[PDB]
Amino acid sequence: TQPALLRLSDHLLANGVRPVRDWRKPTTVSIDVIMYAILNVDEKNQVLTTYIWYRQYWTDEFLQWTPEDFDNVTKLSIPTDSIWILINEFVDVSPNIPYVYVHHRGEVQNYKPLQLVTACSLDIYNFPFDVQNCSLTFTSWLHTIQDINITLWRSPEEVRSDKSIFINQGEWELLEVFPQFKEFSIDISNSYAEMKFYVIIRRRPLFYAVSLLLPSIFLMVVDIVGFCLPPDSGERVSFKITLLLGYSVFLIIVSDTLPATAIGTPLIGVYFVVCMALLVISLAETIFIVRLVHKQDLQRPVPDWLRHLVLDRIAWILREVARDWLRVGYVLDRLLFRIYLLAVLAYSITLVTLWSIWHSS
Amino acid sequence: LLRLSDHLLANYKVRPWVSIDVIMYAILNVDEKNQVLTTYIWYRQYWTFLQWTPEDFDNVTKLSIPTDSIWVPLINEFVDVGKSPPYVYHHRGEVQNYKPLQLVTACSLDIYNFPFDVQNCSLTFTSWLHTIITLWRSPEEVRSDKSIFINQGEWELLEVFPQKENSYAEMKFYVIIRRRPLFYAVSLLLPSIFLMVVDIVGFCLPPDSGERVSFKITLLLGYSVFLIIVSDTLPATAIGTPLIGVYFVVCMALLVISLAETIFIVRLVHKQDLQRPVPDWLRHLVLDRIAWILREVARDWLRVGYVLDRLLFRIYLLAVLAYSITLVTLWSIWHSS
Amino acid sequence: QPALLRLSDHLLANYKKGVRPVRDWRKPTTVSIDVIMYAILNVDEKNQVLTTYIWYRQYWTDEFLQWTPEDFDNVTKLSIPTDSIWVPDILINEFVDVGKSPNIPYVYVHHRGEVQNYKPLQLVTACSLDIYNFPFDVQNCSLTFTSWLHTIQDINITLWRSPEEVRSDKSIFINQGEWELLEVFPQFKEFSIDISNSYAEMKFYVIIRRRPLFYAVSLLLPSIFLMVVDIVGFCLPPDSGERVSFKITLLLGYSVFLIIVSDTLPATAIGTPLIGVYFVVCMALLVISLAETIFIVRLVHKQDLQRPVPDWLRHLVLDRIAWILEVARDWLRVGYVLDRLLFRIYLLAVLAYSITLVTLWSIWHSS
Amino acid sequence: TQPALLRLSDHLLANYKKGVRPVRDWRKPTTVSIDVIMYAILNVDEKNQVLTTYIWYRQYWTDEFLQWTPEDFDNVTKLSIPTDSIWVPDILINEFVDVGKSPNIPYVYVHHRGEVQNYKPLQLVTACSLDIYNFPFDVQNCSLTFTSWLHTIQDINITLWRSPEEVRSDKSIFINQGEWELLEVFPQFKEFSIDISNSYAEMKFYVIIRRRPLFYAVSLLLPSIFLMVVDIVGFCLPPDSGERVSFKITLLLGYSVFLIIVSDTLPATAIGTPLIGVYFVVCMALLVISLAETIFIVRLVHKQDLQRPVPDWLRHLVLDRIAWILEVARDWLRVGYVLDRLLFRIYLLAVLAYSITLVTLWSIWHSS
């Protein structure tokens, strides 16, 4: 019921407040963090939900004992009976541990694990080849440096490569938990201490590559291969109609899929719009030709406005309608094909650039 | 230190016969069905009997005490706290209390001109038990901005104006927040724009043909999937607000009317035989409407179909113009607030 | 000291919880309940849970608290923390989650003994949700308040109001959701677990409807219009030609539409909604009809591949066409026969869909 | 004083001590009978490996400290006592994550002869071993275990309040119409010993539950069959080198929309499930290969005027494929047709394998 260790605990507990003989000396706190999993990242809310193994320890004075005191006991499990660090970016919160382990020499240590929902400045410009940088911090306000001096438990090298127990499952890959030490000072109690934890994470783009990038790349290739092969007037109109109708719904779904923030929508989100702006236009133009070749009405609006434009266009690029209007349609078709090639080339360059940025870091 | 603690515990006891500062860290999701605004708050309380001899303790000039030791100065318009996260913190007392408060505060919402909604909420702080609070910093500093804020969610913190009086004195904060339209510039506005551009393009197709009937029905299906998709994203499923419900009505109903007209004309062209004569009142109506817009009977039926199609096209162009003007005006109002 | 504090100090100093507040333990402690529905927050058919909001209201007569008001400044109402007063153990059987907890730990007591407890509950009530009629559902959930430990002889539950009054009470309910409250019909029962032990149970059946307008314009209008345009695809487009592309476009649009609706239609273990049977029967026809028209093409302009065209097949098609009413010409004729058969099947399917919709709406409206 | 039950409660609680076992003589075990009735199975999180349930836990035992003759106290026999004032077994659930959002009933029932009952709803969130391999035709043998926190067998002995067959066939209150069907609750009494003199008796129930594939008949089965059937329709006329490119690309976008839609709906894991991992990779892969083949064949046919002729090895492959599957531009057309037929045969094999896998899984899931 009450063995020797229980008697020792009673002795040490019967008799808050800093556990320091002298207030002049500071109460250094050793801190450490282990990243278990990145549960979720909400770009809409700009928050990050993750699992943190929170390692903490510091030395006291009123809890020191010796093994000879009671049955050679050096380790004790003391409940946190109102005994004597916070996160600035905490927004909402875990198998809480009620009993903390203490050593005979006065050291208190714990490894409380907890879910943590922090506030991050998520930049979604790159997508799905995304790479974030979250900076959950540790610091106290009234417990300034003179009172609490926050220091690392372990040297930065071994904590910045703390992949020992990372689950490495889900959507995100941790890369680095780089710690940093800096002092924040306002015009009151100028000696606050801050410990920064820049948890660098990264996205896994395989799912989005085969559901966002592949369909759009293949749609662009199909659009391009739909130019040279079908005649300027004929079954091309139905080809473009089917492509446009399919891409409209695909784009509705993608819009519902792409994450969006205040900074701006992803960079690929500009090539989804362009790749549609060149469908509609394309469709429109071919329809006009189909309705202005087999069906005739009026004539070309003066050379100054139509013939001159097409003449200059071909110059710097390289039965009154037959061979008189089909030429205009052909030149317009070639121009739109050139625009399509430029658009797909730019899309591929941005894809490779985003992938390189994601892979390098 | 312990001697100081015992000295103060013996000295101190019950009232010993206040300045408030509030900072909004981040505005969380705003619930329309609950009429409640959820936010993260940092709260600072200041108030000048707790005395100790300085020389004996080397003039500490500062101290940390358990929370349940000194008398402390609650929220009124709230339904929950949110499990928010105390070593109460001078040389002659004047203890102060810092704490991350958070808030789930009842508020009034308009949401009439979504996504350009701009909302205001009132946060009234007042004493609970003691009858008849002041600023800690100048009003301009509080209203200007918060040194800490995410400022990247769909809700932007625009203004916090501070300000009234069993009698109590109350501190009122008018917090004006402003929704960010750019959040919906790819999930709500781009689909609406291009689903109308596609329909405009489809109007160019010849009437009374399989091409256009299939085009229109597939566009109706696309509108339906778009509505299903944005029902959940919106705070209210098809809010019915102007620019959201009115757009869907004026566009889907017009597409349905056009599809019905196309189906009717297709049937009347298919039956190439004796057919019900074109009504005389319809004849005059089309004869004057064509001006207002500017086998033997098969051509007449095709002509009436074409003129009705052009009337529908003009109506839909008018609807697109109205939508564009509404969007421009609402964006200007939002940018002028 | 204020009179309230003086009264409460002595009224609760010797007050013991646990003990039923009755002088004669033989008599029961009638606990009258009342539930006012406030908002049907959600109805999840996947987990079979109705997330609702109610204003629970308990009244019982405590024999230990009655006091003379004359000696306490004519005070008749006293507020006491709930934890500091015996409360009945009445619990909801269907309860599987408490959700939000607008805790208010205080209860008013009259000088005669009667207690005035009430609190708001955001319940997650386990319920049997039948979605057969989606979107015209009519759910009939139940909330049974019963005493887990105390028997009927110990606690008897009744209504604070008349059953008719509770049934028609809809003032507090907010009609700003997807479900429209019809009634909260109360009933009483004596649950017999054995020969001797019996419990008092009060079942409030909450009957609610759907608002099918959103699904009547998002799920039932596109499908009906697709049925109608697919039918009219038989009119101007003949058995060959521009019908192939018409059907291809219809099919490719309907495939995505069906992916989305299947993702949208609620699904329960017992069975999918009846409407969801005329979507398959629609798609199952398109694939057939398309597969039909294509065939005719490859047997008119590509007639080199001579099919067996058995004599019994010709007799069968002749009999079928009779009942209804170069081999290129013969292939065209048999294609016309098959097209007429498919048109009749399409008409029957659309008639059945329309009759199903109108009878579902009639059932929903009459309820 | 006058209230009989008040006097009885005061008498019983005057001497009662909550810190000691209610045994008149030390050195004798106390039998803590247990009963578990299973209510709805709220959730099964496979990516967290947790099972969230709702149980009507019941404890029974004998407290020989609460002995009192009914005659001496006005023929009273039933009483209720606050839980905090009485000793209650510290039965704990291992493989247990968290608990809450349940109605805390604070009363414990007591009879004249001393027996005590304690009823307790519990929304247990317990760690399990969820395999989710053959989703949606899936069975989970989750487990609950009740142990004595700090009491050996010599003090507390765990036992069932009813016959094991009665507990196994207990589905009187289960909310059946949900996704999960509770096959059985099989109890088992085991002994976990850290020492000969330090042994704890444990009672573990095996909750064997199985998914309902009809739940995903519309979400997964119907789309996954309609898309396959539409693709097989496409493999016919439209013929290769024609309007098949638009058909195939729109079908690929439909597949991608399906994948996006079911990514969130499906309670699956990045580890994956063969029925969903495969037969969604073998469908999109075949669609992409057929789309590329159609693009290449149609481009070559339309452009023509290719300086490079049909390679000899290509002719050999055509010869070595044609016998079993069944002008330069015409030769390219023939090669395209042969490749199209090969892809069609592979797609027919893929759909046949999909059907066989579904039937096999439904058989292993045992018929209704």
Swiss-Prot record, chain A:
Protein's UniProt name? 5-hydroxytryptamine receptor 3A
Q: How does it sit in the membrane?
A: Multi-pass membrane protein
Q: Which InterPro entries match?
A: 5HT3_rcpt, 5HT3_rcpt_A, LGIC_TM_5-HT3, Neur_chan_lig-bd, Neur_chan_lig-bd_sf, Neur_channel, Neuro-gated_channel_TM_sf, Neuro_actylchol_rec
Q: Is the keyword Cytoplasm assigned to this protein? A: no
Tell me its family: Belongs to the ligand-gated ion channel (TC 1.A.9) family. 5-hydroxytryptamine receptor (TC 1.A.9.2) subfamily. HTR3A sub-subfamily.
Q: Which residues are glycosylated?
A: N72, N133, N149
The record's function comment reads: Forms serotonin (5-hydroxytryptamine/5-HT3)-activated cation-selective channel complexes, which when activated cause fast, depolarizing responses in neurons.
Tissue specificity is: Brain, spinal cord, and heart.
Extracellular side stretches: 1-204, 256-265, 359-361
Residues on the Cytoplasmic side? Answer: 232-236
Task: Write out the domain note.
Answer: The HA-stretch region of HTR3A seems to be responsible for the low conductance of HTR3A homomers compared to that of HTR3A/HTR3B heteromers.
| Protein localization | Postsynaptic cell membrane; Cell membrane
Its ancestry begins with:
Eukaryota, Metazoa, Chordata, Craniata, Vertebrata
- Gene Ontology, cellular component aspect: cleavage furrow; postsynaptic membrane; serotonin-activated cation-selective channel complex
Q: Which UniProt keywords apply?
A: Cell membrane, Disulfide bond, Glycoprotein, Ion channel, Ion transport, Ligand-gated ion channel, Membrane, Postsynaptic cell membrane, Receptor, Signal, Synapse, Transmembrane, Transmembrane helix, Transport
Q: Which domain of life is it from?
A: Eukaryota
What molecular function does GO assign, one term? ligand-gated monoatomic ion channel activity involved in regulation of presynaptic membrane potential
Catalytic activity, reaction form = Na(+)(in) = Na(+)(out); K(+)(in) = K(+)(out); Ca(2+)(in) = Ca(2+)(out); Mg(2+)(in) = Mg(2+)(out)
Q: Does the keyword Glycoprotein apply?
A: yes
Record field: transmembrane:
205-231, 237-255, 266-284, 339-358
**Assembly:** Forms homopentameric as well as heteropentameric serotonin-activated cation-selective channel complexes with HTR3B or HTR3C or HTR3D or HTR3E. The homomeric complex is functional but exhibits low conductance with modified voltage dependence, and decreased agonist and antagonist affinity. Heteropentameric complexes display properties which resemble that of neuronal serotonin-activated channels in vivo. Interacts with RIC3.
Q: List the disulfide bonds.
A: C120-C134
Provenance organism: Mus musculus
Which GO biological process categories is it annotated with?
A: inorganic cation transmembrane transport; serotonin receptor signaling pathway; serotonin-gated cation-selective signaling pathway
From Swiss-Prot, chain D:
This protein's source sits in the domain of life called Eukaryota
The entry annotates sugar attachment on N75, N141, N157
Protein localization: Postsynaptic cell membrane; Cell membrane
Tell me which InterPro entries the record gives. 5HT3_rcpt, 5HT3_rcpt_A, LGIC_TM_5-HT3, Neur_chan_lig-bd, Neur_chan_lig-bd_sf, Neur_channel, Neuro-gated_channel_TM_sf, Neuro_actylchol_rec
Q: What is the recorded membrane topology of this protein? A: Multi-pass membrane protein
Q: Disulphide bridges in this chain?
A: C128-C142
Q: What tissue specificity is annotated for this entry?
A: Brain, spinal cord, and heart.
Which Gene3D superfamilies would you find in this protein's record? Neurotransmitter-gated ion-channel ligand-binding domain, Neurotransmitter-gated ion-channel transmembrane domain
Chain ranges passing through the membrane: 213-239, 245-263, 274-292, 346-365
- Provide the assembly information: Forms homopentameric as well as heteropentameric serotonin-activated cation-selective channel complexes with HTR3B or HTR3C or HTR3D or HTR3E. The homomeric complex is functional but exhibits low conductance with modified voltage dependence, and decreased agonist and antagonist affinity. Heteropentameric complexes display properties which resemble that of neuronal serotonin-activated channels in vivo. Interacts with RIC3.
Q: What is the name attached to this protein's record?
A: 5-hydroxytryptamine receptor 3A
